[PDB]
Amino acid sequence: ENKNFVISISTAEQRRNHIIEQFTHQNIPFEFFDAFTPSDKLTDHLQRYLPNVANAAQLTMGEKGCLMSHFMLWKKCIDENLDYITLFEDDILLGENANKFLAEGDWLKVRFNFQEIFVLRLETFLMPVQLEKQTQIPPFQQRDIDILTSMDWGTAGYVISQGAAKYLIALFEKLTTEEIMPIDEIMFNQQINATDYRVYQLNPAICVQEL
Amino acid sequence: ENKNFVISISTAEQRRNHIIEQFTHQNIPFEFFDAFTPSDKLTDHLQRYLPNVANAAQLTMGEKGCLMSHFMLWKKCIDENLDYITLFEDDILLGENANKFLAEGDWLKVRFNFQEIFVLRLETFLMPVQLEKQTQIPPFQQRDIDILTSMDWGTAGYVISQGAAKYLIALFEKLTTEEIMPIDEIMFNQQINATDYRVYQLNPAICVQELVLN
Numbered sequence: 552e553n554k555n556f557v558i559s560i561s562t563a564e565q566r567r568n569h570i571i572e573q574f575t576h577q578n579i580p581f582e583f584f585d586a587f588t589p590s591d592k593l594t595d596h597l598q599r600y601l602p603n604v605a606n607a608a609q610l611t612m613g614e615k616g617c618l619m620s621h622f623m624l625w626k627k628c629i630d631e632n633l634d635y636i637t638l639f640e641d642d643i644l645l646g647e648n649a650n651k652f653l654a655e656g657d658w659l660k661v662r663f664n665f666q667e668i669f670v671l672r673l674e675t676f677l678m679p680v681q682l683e684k685q686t687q688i689p690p691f692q693q694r695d696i697d698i699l700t701s702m703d704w705g706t707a708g709y710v711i712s713q714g715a716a717k718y719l720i721a722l723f724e725k726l727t728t729e730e731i732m733p734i735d736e737i738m739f740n741q742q743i744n745a746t747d748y749r750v751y752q753l754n755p756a757i758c759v760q761e762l
Numbered sequence: 763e764n765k766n767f768v769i770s771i772s773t774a775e776q777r778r779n780h781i782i783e784q785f786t787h788q789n790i791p792f793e794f795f796d797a798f799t800p801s802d803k804l805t806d807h808l809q810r811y812l813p814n815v816a817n818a819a820q821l822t823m824g825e826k827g828c829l830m831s832h833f834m835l836w837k838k839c840i841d842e843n844l845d846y847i848t849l850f851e852d853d854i855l856l857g858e859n860a861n862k863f864l865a866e867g868d869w870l871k872v873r874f875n876f877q878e879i880f881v882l883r884l885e886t887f888l889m890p891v892q893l894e895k896q897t898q899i900p901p902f903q904q905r906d907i908d909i910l911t912s913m914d915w916g917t918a919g920y921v922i923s924q925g926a927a928k929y930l931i932a933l934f935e936k937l938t939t940e941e942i943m944p945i946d947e948i949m950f951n952q953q954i955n956a957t958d959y960r961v962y963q964l965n966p967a968i969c970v971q972e973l974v975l976n
């Protein structure tokens with residue numbers, strides 16, 4: 552019974568082929584989840600489920616789409632009473648023995664009760680902030696002078712327990728328009744010690760974003 | 763004239779020895795700046811210079827001390843009309859060729875107009891994360907299950923232009939108690955789409971905090 556969902560724009564043929572290839576070559580079942588893109592459907596979903604986010608001028612509609620995709624998958628976890636769901640974004644590369652973690656679930660069931668509130672990150676945890684190149688100020692001693700353009704965190708591969716799905720849906724629902732930030736920044740900022748929400752990290756990681 | 767200042771609690775002997783060792787071994791001049799700590803002095807400085815921060819329950823007094831230390835160094839930059847000042851925290855480790863960047867400033871003077879508003883980060887630029895080991899949930903397939911938390915991003919090594927010192931002093935002075943946030947968030951994250959204020963990052967970095975290397 553399938554736990555792995557890959558968020559992917561329906562027309563992203565090159566990414567989907569790479570995902571198919573990777574999952575089939577390790578014999579890991581999965582389904583694509585058709586990512587929300589700028590569209591009437593996304594507009595409607597924002598208005599109905601996250602009215603606060605629809606108003607947030609600080610995010611691109613694409614960022615709102617990615618957020619909505621994660622959020623609806625969490626909702627699926629609740630609605631279908633799944634113990635956990637494993638979410639990916641469609642540019643991950645699976646590491647070597649990933650099938651021991653993703654084709655089989657007993658290792659998780661033996662370790663956690665799924666009403667516990669946790670995420671288990673499967674992707675790398677050493678991630679650079681997003682830097683832009685610039686051409687006007689020359690490098691010095693073979694070091695570039697780049698411009699910081701955002702704090703970037705991975706939401707490309709993680710297990711979320713039913714408990715954590717409930718917690719995150721409630722959290723995202725309660726955020727005001729002013730508090731909205733990209734999903735990765737919201738989730739990054741939730742990773743603190745004074746809460747019931749616990750974030751575990753697989754170390755070393757078993758997948759990584761392509762670029 | 764010295765541009766490098768290392769923020770350090772006056773009694774922090776082990777850190778100061780490590781800083782002395784590192785800077786002297788690469789022949790980089792610097793001065794210690796006595797960090798503000800929870801104390802009468804910090805309380806008084808908060809009340810006089812940053813009254814809205816004294817009330818801010820979202821920062822610990824220690825964090826307010828670190829903030830006050832940076833802030834008074836920016837004020838020094840303004841009072842002394844320095845083109846730039848280069849600030850470190852007392853846990854940095856200098857990279858290999860750090861002296862090419864820190865012992866002299868000509869490479870900066872030929873590159874930037876210091877009336878422009880910018881900070882140039884010198885330290886590593888990974889998302890600020892820490893892993894706690896735990897033994898109660900067993901590893902699987904030779905992979906540990908660690909506990910992951912976020913921490914503040916580094917303010918442990920950066921060059922700040924006079925323009926940016928003026929801008930940040932003005933900004934911090936105007937923030938209400940509710941708007942106060944960690945220094946890193948105010949300096950870096952919140953200014954990403956500011957009209958004049960730029961944050962540059964030296965890539966690859968030339969220094970790293972003792973804790974981030976680990």
Ligand SMILES: O=c1ccn([C@@H]2O[C@H](COP(=O)(O)OP(=O)(O)O)[C@@H](O)[C@H]2O)c(=O)[nH]1
Pocket residue numbers: 558559560586587588589612613614616617618620639640641642
């Ligand atoms: O309009 C969009 C654009 C992207 N995505 C999803 O966002 C994820 C991350 O996309 P990408 O790697 O392009 O973004 P980045 O990692 O650059 O933030 C992918 O799963 C996409 O399918 C989405 O739901 N809606």
Ligand SMILES: O=c1ccn([C@@H]2O[C@H](COP(=O)(O)OP(=O)(O)O)[C@@H](O)[C@H]2O)c(=O)[nH]1
Pocket residue numbers: 769770771797798799800823824825827828829831850851852853914971
């Ligand atoms: O009350 C204090 C405690 C610390 N610091 C300074 O804050 C900087 C960073 O301290 P640390 O590396 O302990 O913390 P982090 O990098 O986690 O913010 C150092 O220069 C300390 O001297 C300070 O100004 N006041």
Ligand SMILES: [Mg+2]
Pocket residue numbers: 640642707760
């Ligand atoms: Mg990506």
Ligand SMILES: [Mg+2]
Pocket residue numbers: 704705706735
């Ligand atoms: Mg992302």
Ligand SMILES: [Mg+2]
Pocket residue numbers: 912913914915944947
């Ligand atoms: Mg933070």
Ligand SMILES: [Mg+2]
Pocket residue numbers: 914915916917
């Ligand atoms: Mg700090």
Ligand SMILES: [Mg+2]
Pocket residue numbers: 851853918971973
């Ligand atoms: Mg530090």
